[PDB]
Amino acid sequence: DIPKGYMDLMPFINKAGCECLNESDEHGFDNCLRKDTTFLESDCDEQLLITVAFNQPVKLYSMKFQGPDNGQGPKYVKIFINLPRSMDFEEAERSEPTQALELTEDDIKEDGIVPLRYVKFQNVNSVTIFVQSNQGEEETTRISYFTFIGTPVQA
Amino acid sequence: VPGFLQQSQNSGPGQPAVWHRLEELYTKKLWHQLTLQVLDFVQDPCFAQGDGLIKLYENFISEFEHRVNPLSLVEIILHVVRQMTDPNVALTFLEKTREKVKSSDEAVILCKTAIGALKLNIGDLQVTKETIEDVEEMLNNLPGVTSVHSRFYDLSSKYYQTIGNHASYYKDALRFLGCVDIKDLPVSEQQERAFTLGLAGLLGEGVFNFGELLMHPVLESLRNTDRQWLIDTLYAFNSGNVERFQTLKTAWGQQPDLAANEAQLLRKIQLLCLMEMTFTRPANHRQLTFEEIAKSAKITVNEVELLVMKALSVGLVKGSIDEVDKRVHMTWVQPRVLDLQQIKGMKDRLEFWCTDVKSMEMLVEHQAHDILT
Amino acid sequence: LGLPTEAYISVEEVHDDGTPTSKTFEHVTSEIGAEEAEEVGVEHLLRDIKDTTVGTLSQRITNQV
Amino acid sequence: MVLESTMVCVDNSEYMRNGDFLPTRLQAQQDAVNIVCHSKTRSNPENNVGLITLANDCEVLTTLTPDTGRILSKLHTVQPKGKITFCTGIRVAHLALKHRQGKNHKMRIIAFVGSPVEDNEKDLVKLAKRLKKEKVNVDIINFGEEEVNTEKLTAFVNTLNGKDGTGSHLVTVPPGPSLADALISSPILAG
């Protein structure tokens, strides 16, 4: 897939910065990271907060934020960038995101690629996703596959 | 050690519970809860005449702790010393305790002020004043303790059986009343404290207007029931009114400390009356004739010169006297408490001032609009 | 209008002569001043239609306003 | 074996002014933090350790540092002359962990309570819910006062360990032989 001139940003992801809050121990953060049927599930409630850092600064164009069809796919996502400190759910709800995202149903499918405002993502070091709600309004949310499409800034 | 407690578990009000608690606290080597319990025990309504065994017990506690804060220990020591009632052995006991606890805490300060308080009764000056000086000179970097400053109050206020401690005493007693933020004192004790505060303020040479005395809760809150004459006196004094008949009424209302100084009081109130004049005319007519002072202060026109003389000398006011036309120019810098209606009036004056400034800023801007650009 | 910076210093007094305890930061007069080789940078970043250190009549009346 | 940043929470309240342990309850918690920090550092050489007091305010004397000697030195000269304030202490420790260097470190704090926590159960449970929300493995150890593992602490852990949560093991210390082996048998095996 992916638009011409871009690449999957998987090899540029630094595992030292990755950190997901409210995840069930049985459903690890790597499940959403990996392109398998394995999924990441929130453990406390629907809200989730996943921070991913990169080895080198990168520029994002589109995200593949997809989950299952049972309605537990995300629906409202606040994206913050270059966070100098770990993110708190209270502030994340309060804070103004770099980009707000109302994930329609079609995004959650396997062919769902969500374009991002490339203007605001030109010096991304670490990207934090605050999943505020899910489609089915369940007590928890599942993410089948999450990744980023973009290009390195060639540091 | 617990054997002494067991054999002495009697001889105490409600002895079984409290003494068994002491047993279990000692046998468990619990210290801070034990310190609090023994503090409450010596604070019970009783005489606690078992002075020897309790000093032995606190000896064991203080020897085994070697870390318990000296505050609780020295409070216990103060209570036991007040119990035993003998000067020289108490002095030696306080020296031993202060040698025992030499932490930078407010322990040596507490022992020193206890020494001074006990030594006020004998040798008022030659040992106590220098203890006060030492206490105040190395009393630093502990403002929030608020207990050691209370004891410094005890030292300085009980030092008031002198002449100089009539304005200094008032200042330090006020510093106490500020220091002990919560009242938590018996109504009779606070009544006596407000009584002596009023007496100090009236007789203080350096105290002239000094509000916040009437606004102090400790005084107004509990002097309105009895001895209201002192409250009326304070009202008249800070209101400037001579109030001749009522001021005399209180002059023989409390014959001691007021008959022997009535003249001074008159002097003071006369000066205060002058303040009222310079406070009742808001600079519209700053020139006041000697007739106004003579009638208001109920004095002959020959003494108004001396009255204004004294007022200027003491620093209250900074006017001048035109004797030829019998007037006094007034530019005085002694303010006062402001009587919320008076605060509203002053706010209205400020409203007038600010509206003038705004109107004329608008005028200047409109006129100079060509060049402001 | 006039609030570039405000400086406070903690003091050791309860609240006043006869009041409970507190901390009560005290205001201190604050100025803005630069040494040489730093005034030059400020001047260079400035030099818009602003400045004109010589105070002509129009700027003086503006100052009065 | 596991990357982790631990904010140990030492106690210097006036209720630490106890002789439940032979020299001093404070000294017992002192070598307790010493041995626990040694175990955590030697278990994983890149782990982080920091120090938080809880007397009348929550000083942050030592933050997340792989070094142990400096935290040990800061642990000395502690002067237990205060009163505990648990909720603010855990709040400060949690946000300190939020400021951790490496984001792969599993969040965990070590809290040494030796005084009855004066609080309300509602704030305890809401704080436990918040801490579980951030995936933090708080570890609470009761010392000193006899009301060991109060209902407050029990509810706090259980809500935080909701259905096999982080492992906020509510270990109990005897009022007497609070020896180091009794302080390491349960936690090193499982917090």
Side-chain angles (χ1 to χ4, degrees):
Chain A
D1 207 358
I2 77 90
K4 177 39 154 113
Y6 296 129
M7 59 225 287
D8 201 334
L9 295 184
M10 216 34 40
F12 301 95
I13 287 203
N14 171 33
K15 294 310 295 271
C18 307
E19 162 192 4
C20 160
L21 316 188
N22 285 319
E23 73 148 336
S24 75
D25 297 57
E26 59 263 6
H27 305 139
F29 167 80
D30 250 343
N31 309 356
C32 93
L33 189 292
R34 287 147 16 223
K35 61 281 217 194
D36 322 324
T37 165
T38 36
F39 55 90
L40 169 86
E41 195 176 299
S42 72
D43 79 320
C44 287
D45 38 349
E46 69 274 17
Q47 308 220 135
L48 204 144
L49 206 148
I50 153 191
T51 281
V52 189
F54 307 105
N55 330 118
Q56 57 193 128
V58 74
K59 305 140 45 191
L60 313 164
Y61 179 124
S62 53
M63 83 183 339
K64 305 158 80 54
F65 216 46
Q66 49 191 351
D69 322 61
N70 69 341
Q72 296 187 6
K75 88 176 307 294
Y76 197 19
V77 156
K78 314 180 67 159
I79 309 180
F80 313 79
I81 45 56
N82 298 333
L83 273 186
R85 142 196 75 66
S86 325
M87 189 73 234
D88 163 38
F89 285 90
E90 181 151 356
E91 327 162 9
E93 162 64 26
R94 164 181 46 169
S95 211
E96 160 77 4
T98 282
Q99 182 170 5
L101 196 49
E102 216 81 3
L103 279 315
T104 168
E105 263 86 334
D106 297 359
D107 310 330
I108 308 133
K109 343 319 285 183
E110 223 298 314
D111 45 27
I113 273 179
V114 174
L116 288 178
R117 287 301 310 283
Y118 202 113
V119 182
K120 333 211 174 76
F121 294 83
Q122 294 283 13
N123 229 351
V124 152
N125 282 116
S126 75
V127 40
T128 281
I129 296 174
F130 173 34
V131 180
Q132 191 188 328
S133 308
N134 67 96
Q135 317 286 349
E137 199 78 9
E138 281 77 35
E139 272 141 295
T140 172
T141 80
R142 326 241 307 250
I143 291 174
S144 55
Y145 189 177
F146 143 79
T147 166
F148 274 118
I149 295 314
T151 188
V153 207
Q154 285 131 345
Chain B
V1 192
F4 320 137
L5 204 171
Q6 271 292 78
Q7 77 95 13
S8 54
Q9 74 176 357
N10 208 266
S11 72
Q15 59 98 338
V18 293
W19 290 83
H20 187 74
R21 182 158 67 260
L22 285 137
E23 295 154 24
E24 58 167 300
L25 289 187
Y26 188 90
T27 191
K28 290 168 171 297
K29 312 224 300 190
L30 291 198
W31 301 118
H32 187 240
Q33 324 86 341
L34 158 80
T35 57
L36 264 297
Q37 191 34 248
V38 302
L39 199 35
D40 201 358
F41 181 72
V42 312
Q43 290 324 86
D44 78 328
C46 165
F47 218 45
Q49 267 286 13
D51 199 316
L53 198 34
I54 65 191
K55 54 177 76 62
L56 298 192
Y57 195 24
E58 50 94 354
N59 154 15
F60 305 113
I61 303 314
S62 38
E63 220 284 311
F64 211 176
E65 54 185 62
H66 289 181
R67 52 177 299 230
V68 153
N69 50 32
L71 277 314
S72 33
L73 151 70
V74 78
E75 293 237 350
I76 288 282
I77 293 316
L78 259 76
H79 295 122
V80 81
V81 151
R82 196 230 37 79
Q83 153 59 230
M84 51 79 104
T85 72
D86 193 58
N88 292 33
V89 276
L91 260 283
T92 322
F93 197 25
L94 308 211
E95 317 286 356
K96 291 184 294 275
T97 40
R98 62 168 293 188
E99 271 307 292
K100 172 167 294 300
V101 283
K102 288 166 299 183
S103 305
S104 308
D105 75 302
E106 54 282 10
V108 78
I109 308 98
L110 203 30
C111 79
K112 280 164 125 61
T113 175
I115 287 169
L118 174 56
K119 277 176 143 302
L120 258 275
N121 324 59
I122 45 56
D124 76 324
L125 167 153
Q126 81 289 283
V127 59
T128 83
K129 200 267 309 175
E130 41 280 82
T131 50
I132 298 174
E133 304 316 309
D134 199 348
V135 163
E136 65 62 25
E137 72 90 22
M138 68 64 243
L139 200 34
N140 49 328
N141 71 265
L142 60 172
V145 50
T146 71
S147 34
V148 87
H149 309 263
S150 306
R151 323 300 167 186
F152 200 32
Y153 135 82
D154 287 287
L155 208 37
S156 309
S157 52
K158 297 327 276 179
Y159 201 85
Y160 95 106
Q161 70 307 339
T162 82
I163 282 286
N165 249 357
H166 238 351
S168 149
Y169 162 67
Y170 166 111
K171 173 227 304 172
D172 272 12
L174 265 196
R175 278 149 173 251
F176 176 51
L177 277 163
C179 162
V180 48
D181 37 17
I182 167 64
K183 306 319 289 161
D184 70 91
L185 292 170
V187 158
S188 294
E189 190 273 345
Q190 315 207 350
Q191 269 215 323
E192 161 270 351
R193 182 72 61 57
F195 197 69
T196 179
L197 257 294
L199 291 199
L202 277 274
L203 309 181
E205 45 266 61
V207 164
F208 274 75
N209 200 337
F210 260 50
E212 179 230 16
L213 179 56
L214 312 92
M215 297 326 186
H216 212 316
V218 62
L219 167 139
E220 186 270 315
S221 312
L222 51 95
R223 294 319 295 293
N224 313 340
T225 184
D226 183 21
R227 319 183 276 196
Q228 184 75 326
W229 55 268
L230 198 141
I231 273 303
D232 278 355
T233 282
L234 262 301
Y235 265 6
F237 265 55
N238 261 244
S239 99
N241 168 27
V242 163
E243 195 21 78
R244 180 59 276 121
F245 79 88
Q246 156 191 138
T247 318
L248 187 47
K249 168 43 216 69
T250 165
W252 47 272
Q254 177 224 345
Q255 292 74 3
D257 317 271
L258 250 63
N261 327 288
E262 180 272 342
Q264 290 80 347
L265 269 38
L266 212 29
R267 189 65 153 181
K268 174 159 302 197
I269 186 53
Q270 279 170 335
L271 285 176
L272 265 303
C273 176
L274 166 138
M275 314 270 216
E276 182 78 9
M277 325 286 280
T278 196
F279 195 72
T280 191
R281 296 300 330 124
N284 189 4
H285 332 113
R286 263 303 187 242
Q287 303 307 95
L288 55 64
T289 167
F290 301 161
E291 282 329 292
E292 305 177 79
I293 309 186
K295 155 210 52 57
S296 95
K298 312 159 193 175
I299 200 63
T300 70
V301 308
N302 309 26
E303 325 297 326
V304 60
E305 302 318 293
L306 271 308
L307 180 71
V308 183
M309 269 317 334
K310 190 47 174 296
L312 299 150
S313 60
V314 292
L316 276 46
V317 307
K318 304 162 326 302
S320 297
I321 306 105
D322 177 297
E323 208 280 331
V324 179
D325 312 350
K326 315 277 173 289
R327 332 192 81 78
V328 170
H329 190 62
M330 279 312 344
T331 89
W332 113 100
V333 281
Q334 199 73 7
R336 34 161 49 74
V337 310
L338 254 287
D339 202 326
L340 267 283
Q341 179 57 37
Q342 289 181 344
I343 274 295
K344 258 288 199 57
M346 165 186 264
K347 173 219 105 85
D348 217 353
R349 293 170 63 182
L350 208 82
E351 188 90 78
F352 286 157
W353 190 7
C354 77
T355 206
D356 269 1
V357 168
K358 159 66 83 181
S359 91
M360 158 135 62
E361 162 204 349
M362 281 309 69
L363 168 141
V364 170
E365 210 148 36
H366 171 41
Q367 295 289 348
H369 175 36
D370 307 353
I371 71 179
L372 302 187
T373 326
Chain C
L1 80 174
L3 64 171
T5 165
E6 300 283 53
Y8 307 135
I9 170 61
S10 170
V11 285
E12 181 177 17
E13 169 61 21
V14 296
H15 198 235
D16 261 349
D17 56 354
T19 35
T21 166
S22 284
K23 305 311 286 280
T24 318
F25 269 118
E26 300 308 77
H27 146 69
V28 204
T29 43
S30 311
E31 283 201 61
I32 304 302
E35 73 278 51
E36 294 328 341
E38 191 177 81
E39 274 267 10
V40 59
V42 168
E43 171 81 359
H44 193 88
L45 300 172
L46 300 194
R47 276 241 46 181
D48 300 340
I49 207 67
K50 44 201 58 154
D51 311 279
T52 321
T53 165
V54 160
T56 171
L57 179 47
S58 186
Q59 317 172 177
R60 298 297 294 281
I61 310 302
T62 279
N63 189 15
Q64 317 266 314
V65 163
Chain D
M1 53 315 290
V2 43
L3 258 287
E4 85 79 18
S5 296
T6 278
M7 224 51 194
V8 318
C9 287
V10 83
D11 182 1
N12 41 1
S13 67
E14 261 314 305
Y15 272 3
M16 201 61 12
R17 189 41 61 60
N18 283 340
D20 255 326
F21 194 78
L22 307 321
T24 280
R25 221 41 182 191
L26 163 78
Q27 199 75 359
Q29 84 157 357
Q30 156 154 2
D31 36 2
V33 312
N34 167 36
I35 62 188
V36 85
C37 171
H38 275 352
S39 86
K40 290 232 167 301
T41 284
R42 101 174 73 261
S43 62
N44 208 23
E46 57 299 6
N47 270 346
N48 245 341
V49 201
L51 172 70
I52 272 291
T53 53
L54 281 84
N56 79 32
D57 160 275
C58 323
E59 306 77 294
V60 197
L61 314 175
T62 279
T63 169
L64 283 315
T65 166
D67 179 281
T68 290
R70 64 192 307 78
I71 133 182
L72 279 193
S73 290
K74 279 321 200 71
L75 202 284
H76 222 185
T77 69
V78 56
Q79 308 344 324
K81 319 296 189 315
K83 196 260 282 190
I84 194 192
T85 310
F86 183 63
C87 43
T88 73
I90 160 72
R91 217 76 65 98
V92 173
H94 161 46
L95 81 84
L97 268 198
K98 240 165 44 164
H99 282 210
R100 64 213 182 84
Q101 265 320 357
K103 261 53 183 188
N104 42 333
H105 303 180
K106 317 207 105 72
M107 263 99 72
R108 152 174 305 286
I109 88 162
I110 300 317
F112 271 157
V113 49
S115 167
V117 287
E118 44 286 65
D119 271 290
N120 170 26
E121 186 57 86
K122 303 172 49 190
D123 57 63
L124 255 300
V125 59
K126 76 160 66 66
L127 196 39
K129 290 184 184 308
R130 277 247 310 278
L131 259 300
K132 185 164 163 280
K133 197 88 170 301
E134 261 71 4
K135 198 165 309 305
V136 181
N137 305 5
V138 66
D139 216 21
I140 186 52
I141 295 123
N142 188 289
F143 255 35
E145 66 104 31
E146 87 273 10
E147 193 206 349
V148 290
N149 330 110
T150 106
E151 315 68 9
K152 288 188 136 297
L153 275 311
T154 325
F156 166 80
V157 152
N158 293 21
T159 46
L160 206 148
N161 275 4
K163 192 30 78 197
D164 178 23
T166 81
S168 294
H169 328 72
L170 247 198
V171 78
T172 309
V173 82
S178 324
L179 271 297
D181 200 71
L183 306 167
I184 74 168
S185 51
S186 29
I188 301 317
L189 174 138

